[PDB]
Design a protein around this nucleic acid. Structure first.
Length: 49
DNA sequence: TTTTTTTTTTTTTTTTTTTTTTTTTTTTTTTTTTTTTTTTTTTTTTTTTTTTTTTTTTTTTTTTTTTTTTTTTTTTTTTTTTTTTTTTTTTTTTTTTTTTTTTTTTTTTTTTTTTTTT
């Protein structure tokens, strides 16, 4: 269907795409949700919603 | 009755070609090795009320160096042409359906003879 989905591409080999509803609201001041996106000595570049 | 001409398949063995046994190179295939996903629990991390002293924005004014500015001549932009690649009509070939025409092979069992090896 059309459902809001996240996508991100990193340096090297990443085109991972999780669903948007897994992450919940937070108050600005805490952050650090620690998403689970394994990366071996590369750098993230892009996120899209 | 003797004697003379010609014709071919064999003594043929050698040249040419064909057939049949061979083994280098790019395309398969089984193994080990490294990327993925789901649970336990676990100290550990992390979400949310209360108080607090803070440190940056908004009253007001100042200037100067980036915002005004006009103009010459470049040079990226656009035009035409042609080549290279992509992609889709067109054609060809092959396979399956069900009644017809044709064929071809592998082994037991015993007993006797050829046909090679020692």
């Amino acid at each position: 269907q059309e459902d809001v989905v996240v996508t991100l591409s990193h340096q090297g080999y990443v085109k991972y795409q999780p669903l948007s509803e897994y992450e919940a609201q937070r108050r600005g001041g805490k952050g650090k949700s620690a998403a689970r996106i394994k990366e071996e000595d590369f750098i993230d570049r892009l996120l899209v919603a």
